[PDB]
Amino acid sequence: MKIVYWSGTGNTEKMAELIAKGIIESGKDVNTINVSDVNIDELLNEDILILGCSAMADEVLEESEFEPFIEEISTKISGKKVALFGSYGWGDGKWMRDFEERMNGYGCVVVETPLIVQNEPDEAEQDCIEFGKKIANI
Ligand SMILES: Cc1cc2nc3c(=O)[nH]c(=O)nc-3n(C[C@H](O)[C@H](O)[C@H](O)COP(=O)(O)O)c2cc1C
């Protein structure tokens, strides 16, 4: 599988590595990929797209890298299974509700409840690992 994310301070990055760990512990292979190094064509071969990005102002996806990537793949992902995750600060997850709605709007099947944790995983570590285990059971 493949996990692509954007992280400004490393919070979502940590979530991505814990998610990968859960998938690996379940017996599968995963590659974590920062949005800046992703290859669209190779990404579209996946059955499951695992996407993450922290909440930027105001309750939107990061603008200079992550969103342009989402807009680029938006027309080629109809029918694909998608799993969403991300870290946030002071909000209540609105950027994630909208992120899920957008993906559904593109024709994607959102496989699980999006995983959101406030700031660094830390206490939510097992939650990150478990979310990866749910995805590996798809
Ligand atoms: C410029 C900026 C805007 C932010 N806007 C929001 C916001 O609208 N809602 C929220 O809950 N957190 C917001 N945050 C907080 C980040 O989502 C949060 O600190 C998160 O833990 C960052 O994860 P990352 O290191 O993976 O980027 C903002 C952070 C920055 C730097």
UniProtKB/Swiss-Prot annotation:
Pfam families reported in the protein's UniProt record: Flavodoxin_1
Recorded GO MF terms: electron transfer activity; FMN binding; oxidoreductase activity, acting on NAD(P)H
Ranges of residues in domain Flavodoxin-like: 1-136
Keywords annotated in UniProt: Electron transport, Flavoprotein, FMN, Transport
InterPro entries with a match to the protein in the record: Flav_short, Flavodoxin/NO_synth, Flavodoxin_CS, Flavoprotein-like_sf
Transmembrane segments: none
Cofactor(s), names only, from the UniProt record: FMN
Keyword check for Ubl conjugation: no
Described function: Low-potential electron donor to a number of redox enzymes.
Family per record: Belongs to the flavodoxin family.
Protein name (database record): Flavodoxin
